[PDB]
Amino acid sequence: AKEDTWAFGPIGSPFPDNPVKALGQQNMYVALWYKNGRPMHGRAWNNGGVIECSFPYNKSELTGVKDLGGQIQVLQYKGNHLSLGYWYNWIKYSDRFDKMDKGAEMLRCGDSFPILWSERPGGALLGYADNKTEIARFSHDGKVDEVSGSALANMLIIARELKGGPPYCECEECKSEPPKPIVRVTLNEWADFRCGDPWPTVGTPVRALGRSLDTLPGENPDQYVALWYQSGEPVMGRIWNDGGKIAACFGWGGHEYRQKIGSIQILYELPEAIRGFDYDWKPFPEAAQFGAKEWIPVHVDHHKGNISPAVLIVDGKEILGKADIRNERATIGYGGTEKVLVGPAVHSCMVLCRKAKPGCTID
Ligand SMILES: [Zn+2]
DSSP-assigned letters across all residues of 21-84 = BPTT-SS-EEEEEEETTEEEEEEEEEETTEEEEEEEETTEEE-SHHHH-SEEEEEE--S-HHHH
Q: For residues 296 and 183, give the distance between their C-alpha atoms in angstroms, rounded to a whole number.
A: 20
**Ligand 1 centroid distance, CA of 19 (Å):** 19
Integer Cα distance of 196 and 310 in angstroms: 23
Coil, helix or strand for 352?
strand
Our measurement of the distance from residue 110's CA atom to the centroid of its chain's CA atoms, rounded to an integer in Å, reads: 27
Question: Are the C-beta atoms of 139 and 61 separated by less than 8 Å?
Answer: yes
For ligand 1, the distance from its centroid to the CA atom of residue 173, given in whole angstroms, is 6
163 CA → ligand 1 middle, Å:
10
Where residue 58 falls (left for φ over 0; alpha for ψ -120 to 50; beta otherwise) is left
171 is in an annotated binding site: yes
Residues 6+ apart with CB under 8 A from 193: 200, 246, 263, 264, 265, 266
DSSP letter assigned to residue 163: S
- Work out the end-to-end distance of the chain between its first and last CA atoms, rounded to an integer number of angstroms: 37
Give the span between the Cα atoms of 53 and 137, in whole angstroms: 15
- Distant-in-sequence, close-in-space partners of 200: CB < 8 Å, separation ≥ 6: 191, 193, 246, 266, 268
158 alpha carbon – ligand 1 mean position (Å): 19
> What's the 162 CA to ligand 1 centre distance in angstroms?
12
Which ranges of 177-320 does DSSP label H, i.e. alpha helix? 284-287
Three-state SS for 297? strand
Q: Which of these, 116, 144, 118, 143, lies nearest to 129 by C-alpha position?
A: 116
CA of 176 to the centre of ligand 1 (A): 9
Distance of CA 77 to the CA centre of its chain: 14
What type of residue is 264? I
Measure Cα distances from 46 to 148, 167, 266, 279 in Å.
29, 28, 13, 26
Domain residue extents for the chain: 1-183, 184-362
Residue 241 Cα to ligand 1 midpoint, Å, equals: 29
Q: Max CA-CA distance within the chain?
A: 64
Q: What does the alpha-carbon distance between residue 128 and residue 326 come to, in Å, rounded to a whole number?
A: 37
Q: Which amino acid is at 270?
A: L
Q: How far is the CA of 129 from the centre of ligand 1 (A)?
A: 30
- Is 347 annotated in a binding site? The answer is no
Half-sphere exposure of 149 (CA within 13 A, CB side): 0
Cα(43)–Cα(56) distance, integer angstroms = 10
Q: Quote the CA–CA distance of 252 and 60 in Å, as a whole number.
A: 32
* Nearest-angstrom CA–CA distance, 332 and 320: 7
Query: Please, are residues 145 and 127 in contact by the beta-carbon 8 Å criterion?
Result: yes
| Beta strand spans in 133-232 (E) | 135-140, 143-148, 156-161, 189-194, 204-205, 224-230
Specify the resolution in Å. Answer: 1.8
Handedness of CA 255, 222, 241, 279 (dihedral sign): positive
Q: How many whole angstroms separate alpha carbon 213 and alpha carbon 207?
A: 9
Q: Which candidate, 14, 157, 28, places its Cα nearest to that of 97?
A: 157
Ligand 1 centre to CA of 165 (Å) is 4
Q: How far is CA 156 from the centre of its chain?
A: 17
Cβ–Cβ contacts within 10 Å for residue 127, how many?
Answer: 27
Residue 174 known to bind ligand = yes
> Which segments of 220-358 does DSSP mark as H helices, in order?
284-287
CB hemisphere CA count around 307 (13 angstroms): 24
* DSSP letter (8 states) at residue 92: E
Determine phi and psi for 344, rounding to 5 degrees: -60, -25
How close is the Cα of 180 to the center of ligand 1, in Å?
13
Other beta carbons within 10 Å of 310? 30
Q: From ligand 1's centre to the CA of 79, what distance in Å? A: 10
Q: Which residues in 342-352 are b (16+ Cβ under 10 Å) and which e?
A: eeeebeebbbb
User: Is beta strand 5-10 parallel, antiparallel or unpaired with respect to 60-62?
Assistant: unpaired
Give, as residue ranges, everything with CB less than 5 Å from ion ligand 1. 165, 169, 171, 174
At 10, give phi and psi (nearest 5°): -65, 120
Residues found in the chain: 363
Q: Which amino acid is at 227?
A: L
Distance 170 CA to ligand 1 centre (A): 6
Whether the Cβ atoms of residue 96 and residue 134 lie closer than 8 Å to each other: no
